[PDB]
Each structure stands twice: as structure tokens, then as C-alpha cells.
């Protein structure tokens, strides 16, 4: 009423990441599999550094 | 060290694992040290007059 715009009230702050859907927990698993790939060939005596 | 690395490049092309390459130089390095320790002669039996000359042999080599 005090303004012609009447902005819609967002729940969270601007810039907050996305939310529920399909692939949220899968991204966390793929993030762990990504870090797990770096430590993968370092296993055993015949590994690498 | 570059000579060991340059010769290791050809062996990586053949598909040898690097640990077998590294273990080979470790056994070869100790074997070469064990041979060179036997063949070299001792100079402590000589007197001080000749021991000074051995320093002159190495002094002219380093300068």
C-alpha cells in the first residue's frame, strides 16, 4: 500500500542454494566419489603418490 | 639423476611399473657400492709425507 511495486516476500536470503528435487543426495555421493578417485590409486605398496 | 630419469622414460614406454624400476636402482646402487668398496685401496699405511701428497692430488682436482 505504501508502494506501487509490492515486492513478493522471499522466504530465504538472496543467493541461497537450491533445495529438494531429484539429485541432491546423488550430488553428495558423486562429490565423495570425486574425492575418492584422487585417493584411489594410492592403495597398497604398488600404488603411487 | 637426469640420466636415471632419461633411461626410465624408455622403460615406462615398455610398461614396467615404477616401483620395480625404483627397486632395481636400489639393488643396483648397493651392488655398485659393495663392489667399489672392495676395489679401492687404503692410504693410512703410508707415512705423513706421502699423505700430504694425496691431499695435493685431490686439491688440484677440486681447484
Coordinates of N, CA and C in Angstrom, one line a residue:
Chain A
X1 N 0.8 -1.2 0.0 CA 0.0 0.0 0.0 C 0.9 1.3 0.0
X2 N 2.0 1.2 0.7 CA 3.0 2.3 0.7 C 3.8 2.4 -0.6
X3 N 3.7 1.4 -1.5 CA 4.5 1.4 -2.7 C 3.7 0.7 -3.8
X4 N 3.9 1.2 -5.1 CA 3.3 0.6 -6.2 C 3.9 -0.7 -6.6
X5 N 5.1 -1.0 -6.1 CA 5.7 -2.3 -6.5 C 5.1 -3.5 -5.8
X6 N 5.0 -3.4 -4.5 CA 4.5 -4.5 -3.6 C 5.4 -5.7 -3.8
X7 N 6.7 -5.7 -3.4 CA 7.6 -6.9 -3.6 C 7.1 -8.1 -2.9
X8 N 7.2 -9.3 -3.6 CA 6.9 -10.6 -3.0 C 8.0 -11.0 -2.1
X9 N 7.5 -11.4 -0.9 CA 8.5 -11.7 0.2 C 9.1 -13.1 -0.1
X10 N 10.4 -13.1 -0.3 CA 11.1 -14.4 -0.4 C 11.4 -15.0 1.0
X11 N 11.3 -16.3 1.1 CA 11.5 -16.9 2.4 C 12.9 -16.8 2.9
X12 N 13.9 -17.2 2.1 CA 15.3 -17.3 2.4 C 16.0 -16.0 1.8
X13 N 17.3 -15.9 2.2 CA 18.0 -14.8 1.7 C 18.3 -15.0 0.2
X14 N 18.8 -13.9 -0.5 CA 19.2 -14.0 -1.9 C 20.6 -14.7 -1.9
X15 N 20.7 -15.6 -2.9 CA 21.9 -16.3 -3.1 C 21.9 -17.7 -2.5
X16 N 20.9 -18.0 -1.7 CA 20.9 -19.3 -1.0 C 20.7 -20.4 -2.1
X17 N 21.4 -21.6 -1.9 CA 21.4 -22.7 -2.8 C 20.0 -23.3 -3.0
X18 N 19.9 -24.1 -4.0 CA 18.6 -24.8 -4.3 C 18.3 -25.8 -3.2
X19 N 17.2 -26.5 -3.4 CA 16.5 -27.4 -2.4 C 16.0 -28.6 -3.1
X20 N 15.0 -29.3 -2.4 CA 14.6 -30.7 -2.7 C 14.2 -30.9 -4.1
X21 N 14.3 -32.1 -4.6 CA 14.2 -32.4 -6.0 C 14.6 -33.9 -6.3
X22 N 15.4 -34.0 -7.4 CA 16.0 -35.3 -7.8 C 17.4 -35.0 -8.1
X23 N 18.3 -35.6 -7.3 CA 19.8 -35.5 -7.5 C 20.5 -34.7 -6.4
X24 N 19.9 -34.4 -5.3 CA 20.5 -33.7 -4.2 C 21.5 -34.6 -3.5
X25 N 21.0 -35.7 -2.9 CA 21.9 -36.7 -2.3 C 22.8 -37.3 -3.2
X26 N 22.4 -37.5 -4.5 CA 23.3 -38.1 -5.5 C 24.5 -37.2 -5.8
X27 N 24.3 -35.9 -5.7 CA 25.5 -35.0 -5.9 C 26.5 -35.1 -4.7
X28 N 26.0 -35.3 -3.5 CA 26.9 -35.5 -2.4 C 27.7 -36.8 -2.5
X29 N 27.0 -37.9 -3.1 CA 27.7 -39.1 -3.3 C 28.7 -39.0 -4.4
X30 N 28.4 -38.3 -5.5 CA 29.3 -38.0 -6.6 C 30.4 -37.1 -6.2
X31 N 30.2 -36.2 -5.2 CA 31.2 -35.4 -4.6 C 32.2 -36.2 -3.8
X32 N 31.7 -37.2 -3.1 CA 32.6 -38.1 -2.4 C 33.3 -39.1 -3.3
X33 N 32.6 -39.5 -4.4 CA 33.3 -40.4 -5.4 C 34.4 -39.6 -6.1
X34 N 34.2 -38.3 -6.3 CA 35.2 -37.5 -6.9 C 36.5 -37.4 -6.0
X35 N 36.3 -37.1 -4.7 CA 37.4 -37.1 -3.8 C 38.0 -38.5 -3.6
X36 N 37.1 -39.5 -3.7 CA 37.6 -40.9 -3.6 C 38.4 -41.3 -4.8
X37 N 38.2 -40.7 -6.0 CA 39.0 -41.1 -7.1 C 40.5 -40.6 -7.0
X38 N 40.7 -39.5 -6.3 CA 42.1 -39.0 -6.2 C 42.9 -39.9 -5.3
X39 N 42.3 -40.4 -4.2 CA 42.9 -41.3 -3.3 C 42.8 -42.8 -3.7
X40 N 42.2 -43.0 -4.9 CA 42.1 -44.4 -5.4 C 43.4 -45.1 -5.7
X41 N 44.3 -44.6 -6.6 CA 45.5 -45.3 -7.0 C 46.6 -45.4 -5.9
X42 N 46.4 -44.7 -4.8 CA 47.4 -44.6 -3.7 C 47.4 -45.8 -2.8
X43 N 46.6 -46.9 -3.1 CA 46.5 -48.0 -2.2 C 47.6 -49.1 -2.4
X44 N 48.1 -49.6 -1.4 CA 49.0 -50.7 -1.4 C 50.4 -50.3 -1.7
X45 N 51.3 -51.3 -1.7 CA 52.8 -51.0 -2.0 C 53.1 -50.6 -3.4
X46 N 52.3 -51.2 -4.4 CA 52.5 -50.9 -5.8 C 51.6 -49.7 -6.3
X47 N 51.3 -48.8 -5.4 CA 50.5 -47.6 -5.8 C 51.3 -46.5 -6.3
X48 N 50.9 -45.3 -6.0 CA 51.5 -44.0 -6.4 C 51.3 -43.0 -5.3
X49 N 51.9 -41.8 -5.5 CA 51.8 -40.7 -4.7 C 51.2 -39.5 -5.4
Chain B
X1 N 71.1 -37.9 -11.9 CA 69.7 -38.1 -11.7 C 68.9 -37.9 -12.9
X2 N 69.2 -37.0 -13.8 CA 68.6 -36.9 -15.1 C 68.9 -38.1 -16.0
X3 N 70.1 -38.7 -15.9 CA 70.4 -39.8 -16.6 C 69.6 -41.0 -16.2
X4 N 69.3 -41.2 -14.9 CA 68.4 -42.2 -14.5 C 67.0 -41.9 -15.0
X5 N 66.6 -40.6 -15.0 CA 65.3 -40.3 -15.5 C 65.1 -40.4 -17.0
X6 N 66.2 -40.1 -17.7 CA 66.1 -40.3 -19.2 C 66.0 -41.7 -19.6
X7 N 66.8 -42.6 -18.9 CA 66.7 -44.0 -19.2 C 65.4 -44.6 -18.7
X8 N 64.8 -44.0 -17.7 CA 63.5 -44.5 -17.2 C 62.4 -44.2 -18.1
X9 N 62.5 -43.2 -19.0 CA 61.5 -42.8 -20.0 C 61.3 -44.0 -20.9
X10 N 62.4 -44.6 -21.4 CA 62.2 -45.7 -22.3 C 61.6 -46.9 -21.7
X11 N 61.8 -47.1 -20.4 CA 61.3 -48.3 -19.7 C 59.8 -48.1 -19.3
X12 N 59.4 -46.8 -19.1 CA 57.9 -46.5 -18.9 C 57.2 -46.8 -20.2
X13 N 57.8 -46.6 -21.4 CA 57.1 -46.9 -22.6 C 56.9 -48.4 -22.8
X14 N 57.8 -49.3 -22.2 CA 57.6 -50.7 -22.2 C 56.5 -51.2 -21.3
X15 N 56.1 -50.4 -20.3 CA 55.1 -50.8 -19.4 C 55.5 -51.4 -18.1
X16 N 56.7 -51.1 -17.6 CA 57.2 -51.6 -16.3 C 56.7 -50.7 -15.3
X17 N 56.2 -51.3 -14.1 CA 55.7 -50.5 -13.1 C 56.8 -49.7 -12.4
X18 N 56.5 -48.4 -11.9 CA 57.6 -47.6 -11.4 C 58.3 -48.1 -10.2
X19 N 57.6 -49.0 -9.4 CA 58.2 -49.5 -8.2 C 59.3 -50.5 -8.5
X20 N 59.0 -51.3 -9.5 CA 60.0 -52.3 -10.0 C 61.2 -51.6 -10.6
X21 N 61.0 -50.4 -11.2 CA 62.1 -49.6 -11.7 C 62.9 -49.0 -10.5
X22 N 62.2 -48.5 -9.5 CA 62.8 -48.0 -8.3 C 63.6 -49.0 -7.5
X23 N 63.0 -50.2 -7.4 CA 63.7 -51.3 -6.6 C 64.9 -51.8 -7.4
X24 N 64.9 -51.7 -8.7 CA 66.0 -52.1 -9.5 C 67.3 -51.2 -9.3
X25 N 67.0 -49.9 -9.2 CA 68.2 -49.0 -9.0 C 68.7 -49.1 -7.5
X26 N 67.8 -49.4 -6.6 CA 68.2 -49.6 -5.2 C 69.1 -50.8 -5.0
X27 N 68.7 -51.9 -5.7 CA 69.6 -53.1 -5.6 C 70.9 -52.9 -6.4
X28 N 70.8 -52.2 -7.6 CA 72.0 -51.9 -8.4 C 72.9 -50.9 -7.7
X29 N 72.3 -49.9 -7.0 CA 73.2 -48.9 -6.3 C 74.0 -49.5 -5.2
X30 N 73.3 -50.4 -4.4 CA 74.0 -51.0 -3.3 C 75.0 -52.0 -3.8
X31 N 74.7 -52.7 -4.9 CA 75.7 -53.6 -5.5 C 76.9 -52.9 -6.0
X32 N 76.7 -51.8 -6.6 CA 77.8 -51.0 -7.1 C 78.7 -50.4 -6.0
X33 N 78.0 -50.0 -4.9 CA 78.7 -49.5 -3.7 C 79.5 -50.7 -3.1
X34 N 78.9 -51.9 -3.0 CA 79.6 -53.0 -2.5 C 80.8 -53.4 -3.3
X35 N 80.8 -53.3 -4.6 CA 81.9 -53.6 -5.4 C 83.0 -52.5 -5.3
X36 N 82.6 -51.3 -5.4 CA 83.6 -50.2 -5.3 C 84.3 -50.1 -4.0
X37 N 83.6 -50.5 -2.9 CA 84.2 -50.5 -1.6 C 85.4 -51.6 -1.5
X38 N 85.3 -52.6 -2.3 CA 86.3 -53.7 -2.3 C 87.5 -53.3 -3.1
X39 N 87.3 -52.7 -4.3 CA 88.4 -52.4 -5.2 C 89.3 -51.2 -4.8
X40 N 88.7 -50.3 -4.0 CA 89.6 -49.1 -3.6 C 90.5 -49.5 -2.5
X41 N 91.7 -48.9 -2.6 CA 92.8 -49.2 -1.7 C 92.9 -48.1 -0.5
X42 N 93.5 -48.5 0.6 CA 93.7 -47.7 1.7 C 95.0 -47.0 1.7
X43 N 95.0 -45.8 2.2 CA 96.2 -44.9 2.2 C 96.8 -44.7 3.6
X44 N 96.1 -45.2 4.7 CA 96.6 -45.0 6.0 C 97.9 -45.7 6.3
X45 N 98.3 -46.7 5.6 CA 99.6 -47.4 5.8 C 100.8 -46.5 5.5
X46 N 100.6 -45.5 4.6 CA 101.7 -44.6 4.3 C 102.0 -43.6 5.4
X47 N 103.1 -43.0 5.4 CA 103.5 -42.0 6.4 C 102.9 -40.7 6.1
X48 N 103.2 -39.7 6.9 CA 102.6 -38.4 6.8 C 103.2 -37.6 5.5
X49 N 104.4 -38.0 5.1 CA 105.0 -37.3 4.0 C 104.2 -37.6 2.7
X50 N 103.8 -38.9 2.5 CA 103.0 -39.2 1.3 C 101.6 -38.9 1.5
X51 N 101.1 -38.8 2.7 CA 99.7 -38.5 2.9 C 99.4 -37.0 2.6
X52 N 100.4 -36.2 2.7 CA 100.3 -34.8 2.2 C 100.2 -34.8 0.7
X53 N 100.8 -35.7 0.0 CA 100.7 -35.7 -1.5 C 99.3 -36.1 -1.9
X54 N 98.7 -37.0 -1.2 CA 97.3 -37.4 -1.5 C 96.3 -36.2 -1.5
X55 N 96.6 -35.3 -0.5 CA 95.8 -34.1 -0.5 C 96.1 -33.2 -1.7
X56 N 97.3 -33.1 -2.1 CA 97.7 -32.4 -3.3 C 97.1 -33.0 -4.5
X57 N 96.9 -34.3 -4.6 CA 96.2 -34.9 -5.7 C 94.7 -34.5 -5.7
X58 N 94.1 -34.5 -4.6 CA 92.7 -34.0 -4.6 C 92.5 -32.5 -4.6
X59 N 93.5 -31.8 -4.1 CA 93.4 -30.3 -4.1 C 93.5 -29.8 -5.5
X60 N 94.4 -30.3 -6.3 CA 94.5 -29.9 -7.7 C 93.2 -30.4 -8.5
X61 N 92.6 -31.5 -8.1 CA 91.4 -31.9 -8.7 C 90.2 -31.0 -8.5
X62 N 90.1 -30.5 -7.3 CA 89.0 -29.6 -6.9 C 89.1 -28.2 -7.4
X63 N 90.3 -27.7 -7.4 CA 90.6 -26.3 -7.9 C 90.3 -26.1 -9.4

